[model samples]
Target chain A: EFTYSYLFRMISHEMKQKADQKLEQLDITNEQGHTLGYLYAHQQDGLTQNDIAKALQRTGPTVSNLLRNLERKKLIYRYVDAQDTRRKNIGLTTSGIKLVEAFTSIFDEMEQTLVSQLSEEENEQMKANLTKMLSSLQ
Target chain B: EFTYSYLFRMISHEMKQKADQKLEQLDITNEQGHTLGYLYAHQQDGLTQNDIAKALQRTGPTVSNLLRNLERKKLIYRYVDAQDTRRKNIGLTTSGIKLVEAFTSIFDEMEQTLVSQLSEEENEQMKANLTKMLSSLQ
Candidate 1:
């Protein structure tokens, strides 16, 4: 029998693969791009490793590895917080911001494709149901 | 404003991370498990590499790599069709069947966790919406 979780998994898998293919041009994986997008969106927040790890629901080591990769790519920089030396803050480099701009446009196109596939009303209804289910899962 | 696509992607990302963590115990990645699951479901249908590639929406080389990995793990084997030696049919081994059982049980639990989070009626409604959205994307 068909199950909602199964279908959701498949859809997500396919969509991510498509996104990864496009993101490959930037020489970044989908997960890495998501990390960049998060930092870009929350630049003003001065988020720490713990904060990013919490928000991304990833482990400290995993986030550290992601950060290291981004740093190696010169897409991000880390610094000790002025207020707290023990705390390290993350920020995007100029190139990182530009890459993110490229990424954001691709994401927008992906969103548009999804939007075009359904009527506005259907989109609204599905989003509502999906939101409820997501909250419940959380 | 959270677009439906954004929400869908995040939810999928989170769920896949969880699935990947659990799938690690079986020594197979989530995508590999999905490939195995697909073959398990379509064993009776006598699926070919091309069919699997089409169903998984992956390129020939990608499927080739996946099949190679699975074959190395001894989870799957391919045989030429007697009537058509040019065509190869894929199937699971006894160990493959056992591994698939383990995989299926986990998937069922995942599905049940999702089901428990929603009302029976809500589950049905969301399933319908998700199916429609998936079809739209496809």
Candidate 2:
């Protein structure tokens, strides 16, 4: 018999594949798109590489590689900190901001498609359940 | 202010990361573990590459690469289908079955963690909501 975790994994994988289809059109991966989005949201704070790693829940080396990839693609730029030159602050480029705008709409569209079938009450119930389940796992 | 899609994505990503941590001990990736579980479930059917690709919702070339990886690790074997010489049937090695058995418990532990925090009624409600949400997306 299938369990909730199994179904959760399937749904998650399917959604990623769907997102990847759209992300490919922009020449970015889902992970890269996510990183760009994060950078967009925290642009005012001038987030450092370590801050991005914590927010993304990725390791230092993984975040370093991701940052390098984004930099190579001209989607992001790193600047040395004024207070501490050792710290590299990450920021989105103009292209990255535009890409993030396009990418954000994809999630909105996908979300609309997902919730369209549920009544408002069902949607609420689902959200509550998902939140509880996630907390339980923690 | 969390959208359902965002929460769903986060929960899914967290689950995968948790699963991957355990899977690392076994030296198999999350995708490989999931593929192995699928093969284990359909061993009676003697699945082919096409069948596996369909089941995993991946492309032909992707499945080809995955199968090659598994074969290289002595986890699976491909045999010529007697009815169709052009087709190959995939099966697990003894080691593969053992590995799947080992991997299955991770899901159980995770599932238990997820559900333990909820009442029986809440668990039922969550499962129903998840099912409907998945159906809506499809």
**Residue A90 CA error for candidate 2 (Å)?**
14
What TM-score does prediction 1 earn?
0.42
Write down the lDDT of every candidate, Cα atoms only.
Answer: 0.82, 0.84
Name the regions of candidate 2 deviating beyond 4 angstroms. Answer: A24-97, B20-103, B115-124
In the range B1-138, model 1's lDDT, one tens digit per residue, is: 578677887777666666676679899987788899899999898889999899899999999999999999889999999999799999998888899898667566666776786677767776776676667556
Per-residue lDDT tens digits of candidate 1, residues A1-138? 568677887777767666777789889987798899899999999888888888889999999999999999899999998989899999999999999998778667767777776677777776776676666555
Could you report the DockQ of all the candidates, in the order they appear? 0.28, 0.38
Who wins the DockQ comparison?
Answer: 2
lDDT of 2 by residue, B37-136 (tens): 8999999997998998898898999989999999999999999988999999999999999988887677788888887867888778777767766776
Model 2 chain B lowest lDDT segment of ten:
B129-138
For candidate 2, the TM-score is 0.48
Structure candidate 2, residue pairs in collision:
none
Count: clashes, candidate 2: 0
